[PDB]
């Protein structure tokens, strides 16, 4: 019971620390949708630009907007973890001695299973986190997001982009473990691997988040592939990678921060 709460706090620290660079990343990633929704007046020039305008127009507190969602995200996930993660690992898991391909495939399957299982209960918090991040306001808080989204689109409005998120989880896990196996030291390895994996899986996250953004709007995408097609055709392939640099920055920040807090505890 105590260890649970301590874990909660422990990740709350990391998420809260990484919050300012996260919102900038989310802003750059989702700016076209905000432009469609008349929430943003002009496209951002880049990271520095977004930081500047957001600071001068919203303030300093704004960089932590939506972060409470990230904080309270810990508690429902871990309850599902403790209850199902071991059992799920038991069904697919392998030692590499039993065969590398079996180990890898079982790892993808297990990560995907546990992942989808968590998201089935937790996705809406991610949705709210995103919607609150992307603003300049349209929503007032978590409860407002839930109430309004349910009012317009209902439950499905809260879970939009679920499938590319699951696909994203599997892809990311595969790249992560693959690179981690193919390869001051720990920080290096972790950073490089997480970077490669997050970058290669980044378009799925863009599709996911923008689909989230379409909630509460008359115009929506007709599937993840449809979103992909439209974004590419109108804005270019690079549009799928908007905010990726900021996301990497978020990674390098987060790793150091969580290491420091672990050292402090």
Ligand X SMILES: C=C1[C@@H]2CC[C@H]3[C@]4(C)C[C@H](O[C@@H]5O[C@H](CO)[C@@H](OS(=O)(=O)O)[C@H](OS(=O)(=O)O)[C@H]5OC(=O)CC(C)C)CC(C(=O)O)(C(=O)O)[C@H]4CC[C@]3(C2)[C@H]1O
Ligand Y SMILES: CCCCCCCCCO[C@@H]1O[C@H](CO)[C@@H](O)[C@H](O)[C@H]1O
Residues at the binding site are 73, 85, 208
The DSSP secondary-structure symbol of 96 reads G
* Interface residue with ligand Y, options 97, 184, 264, 265 (CB under 6 A): 97
Comparing CB distances to ligand Y, the nearer of 82 and 100 is: 100
Closest residue by Cα to residue 16 from 256, 254, 265: 254
Binding to ligand X in span 4-63, by CB under 6 A: none
Secondary element (H or E) of residue 240:
none
96's contact among ligand Y, ligand X, none, with CB below 5 to 8 A by partner kind, is ligand Y
User: With contact defined as beta carbons under 8 Å apart, do 175 and 111 qualify?
Assistant: no
- Residue 88, both tokens: 């799920």
Number of chain residues interacting with ligand Y (CB under 6 A): 5
Answer for which of 182, 186, 263, 265 binds ligand Y (CB under 6 A) is 182
Q: Segment 56-85, which members bind ligand X (CB under 6 A)?
A: 77, 81, 85
Q: How far apart are CA 62 and CA 136, in angstroms?
A: 9
Min. distance of Cβ 12 from ligand X in angstroms? 13
Provide the 10 A C-beta neighbour count for residue 151: 10
Q: Out of 208, 210, 242, 250, which residue is the one contacting ligand X (CB under 6 A)?
A: 208
Any residues with CB less than 8 A from the CB of 128 and at least 6 apart, and which? 66, 69, 142, 145, 146
| Contact partners, residue 145, CB within 8 Å, separation at least 6 | 127, 128, 131, 132, 139
| Of positions 122, 179, 249, 255, contacts ligand X by CB under 6 A | 122
Residues between 201 and 260 that touch ligand Y (CB under 6 A): none
Residues forming the site for ligand X (CB under 6 A): 77, 81, 85, 111, 114-115, 118-119, 122, 165, 168-169, 172-173, 176, 201, 204-205, 208
Residues forming the site for ligand Y (CB under 6 A): 96-97, 100, 181-182
């Amino acid at each position: 019971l105590i260890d649970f709460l301590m874990g909660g706090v422990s990740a709350a620290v990391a998420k809260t620390a990484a919050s300012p660079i996260e919102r900038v990343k989310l802003l750059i990633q989702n700016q076209d949708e905000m432009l469609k929704q008349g929430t943003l007046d002009r496209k951002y020039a880049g990271i520095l630009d977004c930081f500047k305008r957001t600071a001068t127009q919203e303030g300093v507190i704004s960089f932590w907007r939506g972060n409470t969602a990230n904080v309270i995200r810990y508690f429902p996930t871990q309850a599902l973890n403790f209850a199902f993660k071991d059992k799920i690992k038991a069904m697919f898991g392998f030692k590499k001695e039993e065969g590398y391909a079996k180990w890898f495939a079982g790892n993808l399957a297990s990560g995907g299973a546990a992942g989808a299982l968590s998201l089935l209960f937790v996705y809406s918090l991610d949705y709210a986190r995103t919607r609150l991040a992307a603003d300049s306001r349209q929503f007032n808080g978590l409860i407002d997001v839930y109430k309004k989204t349910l009012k317009s689109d209902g439950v499905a409005g809260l879970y939009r982009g679920f499938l590319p998120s699951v696909v994203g989880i599997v892809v990311y896990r595969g790249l992560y473990f693959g690179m981690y196996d193919s390869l001051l030291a720990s920080f290096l390895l972790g950073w490089v691997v997480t970077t490669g994996a997050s970058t290669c899986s980044y378009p799925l996250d863009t599709v996911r988040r923008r689909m989230m953004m379409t909630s509460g709007q008359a115009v929506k995408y007709d599937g993840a592939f449809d979103c992909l097609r439209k974004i590419v055709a109108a804005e270019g392939v690079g549009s799928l990678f908007k905010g990726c640099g900021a996301n990497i920055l978020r990674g390098v920040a987060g790793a150091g921060v969580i290491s420091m807090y672990d050292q402090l505890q």
